[PDB]
Paper text:
PNGM-1 is derived from a metagenomic library from deep-sea sediments that predate the antibiotic era. PNGM-1 has both MBL and tRNase Z activities and is considered to be the evolutionary origin of B3 MBLs. The wild-type of PNGM-1 has two MBSs in its substrate-binding pocket, and each is occupied by a zinc ion. The zinc ion in the first MBS (Zn1) is coordinated by the residues His91, His93, His188, and Asp210; the zinc ion in the second MBS (Zn2), by Asp95, His96, His279, and Asp210.
His91 and His93 coordinate the zinc ion at Zn1, whereas His96 and His279 coordinate that at Zn2. In the crystal structures of the H96A and H279A variants, the electron density of the zinc ion at Zn2 is markedly lower compared to that in the wild-type structure, indicating that either a water molecule with full occupancy or a zinc ion with half occupancy is present in this site. The residues His93, Aps95, His279, and Asp210 occupy equatorial positions along the enzyme’s surface. In the structures of all PNGM-1 variants, except in that of H96A, the electron density corresponding to the catalytic water remains despite the complete or partial loss of a zinc ion. Each MBS of PNGM-1 is formed by four metal-coordinating residues, and the substitution of only one of these residues dramatically reduces the metal binding affinity of the enzyme.
Author numbering:
A (entry chain C), B (entry chain B): 2 to 333, 346 to 373
C (entry chain A): 2 to 334, 345 to 373
D (entry chain D): 2 to 335, 346 to 373
The structure:
């Protein structure tokens, strides 16, 4: 597997696992990274939905940032500064739960620019992202204000860029050649939207969560990498959750997007590479799902789990697995009252030795 | 290692690892599990500050619920209804940033009763727990309201218990013979507490975060298990973060408790078992931080890391590691317009085959 | 998942993962753990072929103990005294490589009984398991002998039970209502076999390695669990190894059972549950190997990986993943080879130890 | 931590982890991977003792290669044909046990060259390395002869270079500016030796296993990277294994090198970077072992675990963790034993295979 090693001291070229930080990115390359691939419940194996896009121009975007995902992203050896721009498909906890870890993380890590979040609005004001993020920052006021004694604020504020969720394929973004176009989803209630990044002959479709809609097959068409929701079987639902045979069925026909329906949809889209996510990829579950997609779609497919990579070049769409550090490191008025400051225990004696050495 | 097997087919007694869900709790026993141990930065090896505490009476608490920790908490195979009661040592994102995941996740899981959150105030309204939770709830108002349509809204409530943070070893919880006292800590700004849980002759202190203070050594005294802040050395702060000498020195005095500071307090508390946490537990870090302590403290110590489980009985406080599933499962007006509902693609065909087959 | 938790302080019943040590085995129960599911080449994620079998009568068996398999076998919290019977499907390193780890290992851990090894004959004396095991024990004579000074030599023996590789589903082991049958495979050269375990009306079959043969479909028939080679797709053979098209083809027809061949074999046998192993279980191999079998076989299947476990009861063959300590420990259940030339090289370490030596002696 | 990123599309320099295959080794640089730090029992967390060296010249050695070390070694993305030369400290299974996965593996991992194995003699022929390997090849006879049939058997040769164990720092290897010297060790029985690697004024000592001996401290002097046995405290011997204090107390004074002896030795040696191994590095064990070193040694210290790497440059000795593939694949470098009683067993699967064969061949 991977390229042929030439010299004993020489670097293995075209490695068959992706080491984040180790590889140059082509001007005519994209590098996508599943930093989140599972849904409702948490699990070391699968963070909540989160993707890292890396364009050869230098522009990098996080599309969804759910609970768990921050751990994987931080393993990518990418400084805080470069990951400022965030794109949410809906306001489910497991799509932007970990914005605050980023928000707070990056600020302590030395991020200089404020996070820019694009999201869908709601049917009313309190159902949108402008509201959601506005209340987040209020929620974490005790964090914000304390930190904003010792660190310049600006990297604390969040420039939100809300749009109309109802809008069919309209332009939500356009800088440095990169375009994002959002369109609606039929999931839980009004607001949820699917994205389509377009840049340098390349098209990448983020499906977020949706029961099958007529806006995906249309605006997806002829994409390098197309990601869409693709769910457990109605059998597996009964097994795991103890569901009965009417709820189990409907969940795959009404509320969510089946495998067998995920297939038909991509068959319509004809992407360079289709990507099925948002299911617990386990030894007892993953297979039956793959046999669904196959019924009605026979093109290049990735059954997504955490830290799966796509290198979109001209010639090919190559899937690999990232192998990244678990012991990950970041890479490069007073909120005290005199009632708290007058408590400081004397440790001047306990610490005199190490200090002395440290100061000589 | 562990108990002596007494039959081929029988269970291994006093096993050398803790297998979550596999062991009965005794009546005069306490299980504390570290589900978070690792400062603000994200990494799979170490979730943010989170502890699960099981008492023999049948009560169970969570003390801090920082980003990531829900992946460790959920692996303990505990029905979400038993984990309703949550004590917050403060409102850093790395202490309560995964309550949201608990809130939403646990409600899909099947929590029937609301979440109960014990936290401090600030030195004004918009710096305390009552304010952060109500603004966290409004933050996720789309998630709340969409789910409410299809699941009774009762569990989606959070009952907030603001305590006064100023208070100096004063009761904040007294139910079923279990008594939580708080006291202030010196960290970021006014607000952060430590917790003393008392029950059936046991005492378990949760430090949280604190520069050395005159209250912890007094109020934690003789604790069966004593958890305190322990930072990484002022060389280590230069090595990893590129920090200057002047700053790195300061950090292990003003901002955080040194391993040496940590040693003094533990000398002055003389607990049955000490625990250092909050430092990154690595090959290249752990040994100088462990030594830092040994300058002053000599008795029993754990160097904390995710899924360390303490067993507190009359005779011993025994250290082990929990071995738990990464592929974890849970254990037992509309917000749609007719503009979105119209959008449904037709997949009666593609789903026909499996649909007919499942129904018999 | 699993069973409903009925008390706060009590035990989770029927847990969805298998914690080894943690479950009692009922008398009509069979537990099978995959301790090695991997190809010829080493990898942490997958040990070479190994299987641990637990029958509810108290009897246990390892079928194959290939390279890297002991790390998984040790993780099951079974005392060495309980794992002394080892069956080999052939003498590929990838199938008995770690025999010498269990032998030397267990003898430290404190095993009292010799190891017992059933293995095929060859066409001739020096292609069989008696010859193999004789010359392993010669290969590791410095360990056998040095260890024998300090530890009783009895358990450092290995009684070999060589059977006839040519024999068509004949008994190789009959003991305490347990039967092992062997039949031939078509693999590397003459030697290799499959096994059928017959106990309490249960039939577990360990296929080993073999190009599709006429013996497996016949004898395995109606197995409770039937374990069979399931190779990686010729396409993947090109991609991964840069194999020229026409060679890759030959491998999936001639030298190893392809997924469709496995799919055909398992329709004929009609097992309660069918296991594919041998192949590298990756995010970019497993699925088309599943596709392959599903073309030809429709009933209950597992796609093997390390620490996969089957419990066989009258009512079910349930598949879980085991969750097992990486930081594993052993669970408890003649003249000197020194000359004074080497003994006169010791260092005086009375000073530096004094402090821990004083304290520890109180 | 590590070097600064100064480009968005760029390679991040001086990374705080080591990504095997990803780093260019310099002329004035040695790279030392622990491919195995473990004890006599199996655990996934720690293979039995093994080491890989890669020298700035291009030369690459394995020092010891114990059971379950081949996973970690395969994870390094080094072609098999670059890991030809093997040195054994002793004939403990936990030190050479995975020479047979190297031999069978490497062959199918692209080794065209035969194995060179340097090991020590014992008190007699049957206790040397010549004999061990002789009989190892004889163990896997079935493996050899089937494998070789239609192939060149060259890389199937293990050339053993056996030296005297009682020879005091006498050269056992001199090739392309690399020197290996050996002295004895006190351990089990006359035979175990400890190597020193010399090259470009670099000294890298490979202890092996030994109770404190007078030799190591002399010949390991001014080491760049001095590796040595370090045992668990006599406490951790009573806790886990249930030893009486007497035996527990003695284990650490008589048989094995105590944390305090380890430190007494490295103070005598004065190495640029010492390396304790050969203990189960666990959350309840590692701390009482560091301390017992620190008693009598204050130099740069590594507490060894599987996949730790040391970069030996002119300016420093930098310790790191290797981040590597669990899904390991080999990387490409630059009379038949069948009777017709077995080849007459081949099943018809021409139907089943028809669909995929047609697709693949077009
Ligand atoms: Zn959703
Ligand atoms: Zn804090
Ligand atoms: Zn074979
Ligand atoms: Zn040894």
């Amino acid at each position: 597997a991977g390229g042929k090693v030439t010299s004993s001291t020489g670097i293995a070229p075209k490695r068959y696992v992706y080491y984040p930080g180790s590889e140059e990115l082509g001007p005519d390359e994209i590098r996508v990274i599943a930093c989140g691939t599972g849904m409702p419940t948490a699990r070391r194996a699968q963070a909540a939905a989160a993707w890292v896009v890396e364009l050869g121009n230098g522009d990098k975007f996080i599309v969804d940032i759910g609970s768990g995902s921050m751990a994987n992203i931080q393993s990518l050896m990418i400084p805080a500064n470069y990951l400022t721009k965030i794109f949410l498909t809906h306001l489910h906890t497991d799509h932007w739960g970990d914005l605050v870890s980023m928000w707070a993380g990056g600020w302590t890590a030395g991020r200089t620019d404020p996070l820019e979040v694009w999201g869908p609005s709601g049917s009313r004001e309190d159902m949108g992202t402008k509201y959601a993020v506005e209340h987040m920052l209020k929620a974490y006021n005790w964090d914000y204000m304390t930190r904003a004694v010792t660190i310049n604020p600006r990297p604390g504020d969040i420039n939100v860029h809300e749009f109309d969720y109802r809008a069919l394929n309209e332009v939500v973004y356009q800088e440095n050649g990169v375009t994002f176009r959002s369109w609606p989803c039929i999931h839980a209630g009004d607001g949820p939207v699917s994205f389509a990044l377009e840049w340098n002959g390349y098209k990448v479709v983020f499906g977020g969560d949706t029961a099958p809609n007529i806006w995906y097959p249309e605006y997806a068409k002829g994409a390098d990498l197309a990601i869409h929701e693709c769910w457990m079987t109605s059998d597996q639902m009964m097994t795991k959750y103890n569901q009965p045979a009417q709820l189990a069925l409907r969940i795959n026909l009404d509320f969510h997007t089946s495998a067998q329906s995920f297939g038909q949809i991509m068959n319509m889209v004809q992407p360079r590479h289709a990507v099925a996510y948002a299911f617990f990829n386990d030894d007892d579950t993953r297979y039956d799902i793959y046999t669904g997609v196959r019924e009605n779609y026979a093109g290049p497919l990735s059954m997504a789990t955490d830290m799966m990579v796509w290198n979109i070049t001209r010639d090919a769409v190559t899937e690999r697995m990232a192998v990244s550090p678990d012991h990950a490191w970041d890479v490069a008025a007073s909120e005290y009252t005199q009632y708290i400051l007058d408590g400081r225990l004397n440790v001047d004696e306990a610490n005199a030795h190490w200090k002395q050495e440290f100061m000589g």
